[PDB]
Structure formats: structure tokens, C-alpha cells
Amino acid sequence: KVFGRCELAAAMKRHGLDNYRGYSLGNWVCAAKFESNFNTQATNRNTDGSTDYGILQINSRWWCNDGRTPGSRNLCNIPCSALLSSDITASVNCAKKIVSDGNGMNAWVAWRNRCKGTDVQAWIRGCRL
Template sequence: MRTQSLALLSLSLWVIIISSSFDAVLSKRYMRCELARKLLQQHGFERSLLPVWICLLEHESDLDTAKITANPNGSSSYGLFQINTRYCQQDRRGGVCNIKCEDLLDENLRESASCAKRIQTSEGFRHWNGWQRYCRNTQNLPNLKVICGI
């Protein structure tokens, strides 16, 4: 009986270690310039809008792909772009962007970037509170040309 308990405890510890390692691989907290380059080069974001996106993402998610926010209206917002549950569905593909909300937490930004651009095209940056509070004023935007050489 004691041997079984010890074996179960050992197995549980391995599951925890593997799970925490797995999460660390999937999520990421970006540095400002690293993210700006990735959005520009790999995801086709417009260079002229890049300072707005970086400001927005710094205030919405602190550049962390693993961020989940519970909103006062009962919805949640996921990932780097803090995409609301009306654009994704938990546990299966769905919503306006036809994606799983959990996929928005991945450091691979393909689906989250595509959905964010779709939201911005249809609703503008006003969709995000971070833009309304902090990034609407162009004086608050980072000068990526000076800071990052972009």
C-alpha cells in the first residue's frame, strides 16, 4: 500500500513537471522590439500601424501570450491581443474568428494575429480599452524607428 502511494506521488510529480514545462513552451512574454519585428515580418502588420499595435499590446496584455482576463460582463479575453470570447470559442473552434480561445495563448501568433487584424479592420482600435485609454494619443506611441531600428 505504501509503495503504491509513493509510486502515485512520484507519477503525479512527473505529470506536474511535464505540464509546467509544456506550458512554458507554448506561451511567451515578448520584448517590445522582438514582437514588433515578428508582427511586421512574419504576420504582415502595416509598418505605419506598428507603434499603435505595440502600445496597445503593452497595455492590454503586457506582451504576454498567456494572459487571460475575466471581464465584468462575464466574458473573457485571451492572449497577447486580449481577444474576447465572442471572437473565439472555448474548447472548440468557433466565434467570429472561428478559433479556439485556448489557441490564442500560444506563442505562435498566426491565428491570434489574423483575428486581431480582422477585429481592427471591422471595428478599429476602439475595440480595445488599452487603445482608448493609452494609445489614442499619438504622443504616447513608441518610436520604433529609434527604439528598435524599425
């Protein structure tokens, strides 16, 4: 599914991401925009053989099992394909574990390079939330 900006903002809010570990909703929407262009089916392969999955491009080296990343830790205890669903619950639940692990949203390279330190509230402007 390819979300609209406000649709995704609203879904993320319902799933408890607004201000989760101090990260306002716009951070999450901005991260999803640049990680996946709001496409839950986005995948990207990395040089190390791992693959990033879904709207928040969660990586198979640490977080989900895709059966082809040797040494994966599967810390979210899910198959990576679960992260591609039109239902974002699995991605959100896993993201909450990621953002809690010490490095906050710096785990998302696009967030660090394209969202952090910008006016992220712009990503939810105009939305009925």
C-alpha cells in the same frame, strides 16, 4: 511567451500589421503592451462571463470559442486557447478581423485609453525593423 518590445514589433511587422487598416506598427505594440504587458498567456475575465485572451486580449463573447461563454459568436473561428500560443499568428489574424469590423482599434479599450492620440511611434523607436 513574454515578448520584448522590439521582438514583438518585428513579429507583428512580419505578420502584416504595420499600417494594417491604416494603423502604424507602434499602435499595435502599444495596444499589446497595455492589453497584456506583451504576455501571450494573459487572460482576464469580464463581468459578463466572457474572457479576454492573449497578447491582444481578444474577447470570447465575439471572437473565439472558450466553451464557457454562452452565446459566443466565434467570429475568428478559433478556440481561444489558440490565442495564448507563443506563435502570434492566430492572435494577429483574428486582430485583423477585429480592426476591420468598423471600429478600428477602438475595439481595444487600452488602445483607446492609453495609445490613441499619443506618440505611438515611440513604441518602435530603437528597433531594428
